[PDB]
């Protein structure tokens, strides 16, 4: 008889212890906002999350590494540049297979043919 434990608590009651409106069609708004994120120039990853990303991801290489404020902004920009090129390549490999929707398998082939897998 297979058994498993899920409560994960040796005792119960742990807390009590001393220790008419318009709707655009599915797809309509998207092209309006393709244009919004394309005519715009801001950086599309929130700085505090991305800053925290670079801090949490750089710590393992070298202890107590400080980043110049402009250094993470160069990273922010470089990453967005990297991903918009990869996503144009994605859209191209997706329109190849008689499709509009992308799927990861599109971008593993896009990375494989570019030579980094």
């Amino acid at each position: 008889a297979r058994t498993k434990q899920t409560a994960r608590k040796s005792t119960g009651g742990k807390a009590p212890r001393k220790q008419k409106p318009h709707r655009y069609r599915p797809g309509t708004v998207a092209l309006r906002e393709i244009r919004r994120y394309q005519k715009s120039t801001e950086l599309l990853i929130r700085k505090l999350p991305f800053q925290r990303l670079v801090r949490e991801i750089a710590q393992d290489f070298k202890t107590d590494l400080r980043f110049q404020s402009s250094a993470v902004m160069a990273l922010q920009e470089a990453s967005e540049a990297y991903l918009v090129a990869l996503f144009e390549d994605t859209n191209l490999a997706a329109i190849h297979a008689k499709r509009v929707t992308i799927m990861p398998k599109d971008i593993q082939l896009a990375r494989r043919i570019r030579g980094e897998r």
């Binding site: 008889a1 297979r2 058994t3 498993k4 434990q5 899920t6 409560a7 994960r8």
Partner: peptide
Amino acid sequence: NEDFCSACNQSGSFLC
């Protein structure tokens, strides 16, 4: 097997 009891829908030690 699930993480909840099929009778009371609560967590605990189960017989699978």
